[PDB]
């Protein structure tokens, strides 16, 4: 995951419409990646527990 120039994510002044949109985009991205990270480790651990139980059987 290699990113360079992006958008500003911290703001020192109240601006309104454009800043509301920049904040909303980043908050949307973070919530979606946070969901992906949570679901991934859940599916992974369930599968790891199953495959190690399977080897014993």
């Amino acid at each position: 995951n290699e990113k360079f120039h992006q958008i500003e994510k911290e703001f020192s002044e109240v601006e309104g419409r454009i800043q509301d949109l920049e904040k909303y985009v980043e908050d949307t991205k973070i919530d979606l990646w946070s969901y992906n990270a949570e679901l991934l480790v859940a599916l992974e651990n369930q599968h790891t527990i199953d495959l190690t139980d399977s080897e014993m059987n």
């Binding site: 360079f4 120039h5 992006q6 911290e10």
Partner: protein, 160 residues
Amino acid sequence: SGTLEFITEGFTWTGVTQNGGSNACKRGPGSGFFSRLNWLTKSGSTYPVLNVTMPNNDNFDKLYIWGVHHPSTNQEQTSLYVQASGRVTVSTRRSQQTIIPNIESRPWVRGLSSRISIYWTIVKPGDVLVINSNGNLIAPRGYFKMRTGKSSIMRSDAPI
């Protein structure tokens, strides 16, 4: 763009005094100014209508930084530019920017009530830059070479 590469160009400003300085911007012991900007004032008793063109014969984009001076009194306006009202127009074949200076007394910073507004203009290859000024022009001295790439900027107080 990732660079501050500046190339000085041969602008000819006929009829005006160049390299204006200010004690709010000392360089060394004496007064100075922004190194990349050129503060033009009257020469003798006249400030002519400047009309300069600078074509781009290169294969890259040129970035031009320029400005307009906002005096604080009518006395400062006439004693610098003769004309009671200045005007700065910077255009290309596809854009124009006209700025009328405001003459107002603003809060004092470094002993100054006056101000400068900064503007910019990108000139594509094959296009030309045209500057037309009746007064109050803070002229460019050249262009910055523009690039595309992986460069960016960050706010941080972390040590390197």
